[PDB]
């Protein structure tokens, strides 16, 4: 049900401290927000110019290149979210 | 809130399974027949639960 889905999303958000939002540049980009307080985030575009878009703690090209490979070549969203989270948290 | 279905799929694609009938969260990182079980009926902080889940999702 729509009610139960909303409740499960809220719990996932609390447990993972991961929220999935529309992208602040293109609303159809996806913005992953890490943390209670929007302390870290990264945006990805599906079929545009940049696969990996902006990210609040900006990331060097080596790091961005690694993230694109995890996401486009490996096609592993968990792995991408794990690496991106570590990378962003470590650039704060 | 039609986006909520897709969000739940994304979360489940990480291998994190809400299992509230048992008041716990399951973590299936390897699909090898082993699970991590995180109880919610405890005094663990939100910070500790979040740190644990991401620790298990990592390597």
């Amino acid at each position: 049900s729509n009610a139960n889905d909303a409740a499960e999303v809220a719990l996932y958000e609390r447990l993972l401290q991961l929220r999935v939002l529309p992208g602040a540049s293109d609303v159809h980009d996806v913005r992953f927000v890490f943390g209670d307080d929007s302390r870290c985030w990264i945006e990805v575009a599906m079929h545009g110019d940049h696969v990996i878009g902006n990210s609040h703690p900006a990331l060097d090209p080596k790091s961005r290149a690694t993230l694109e490979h995890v996401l486009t070549v490996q096609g592993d969203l968990a792995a991408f979210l794990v690496v991106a989270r570590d990378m962003l948290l470590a650039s704060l | 809130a039609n986006e909520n279905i897709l969000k739940l799929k994304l979360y489940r694609s990480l291998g994190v399974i809400l299992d509230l009938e048992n008041d716990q969260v399951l973590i299936n990182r390897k699909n090898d027949g082993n699970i991590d079980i995180l109880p919610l009926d405890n005094n663990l902080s939100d910070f500790y639960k979040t740190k644990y889940i991401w620790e298990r999702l990592g390597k």
Binding site: G23, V30, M46, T72, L77 | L6, S13
Partner: peptide, 12 residues
């Protein structure tokens, strides 16, 4: 790739 695609179509 299909999960992000579905989220992008919904957000759009």
């Amino acid at each position: 790739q299909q999960l992000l695609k579905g989220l992008s179509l919904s957000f759009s």
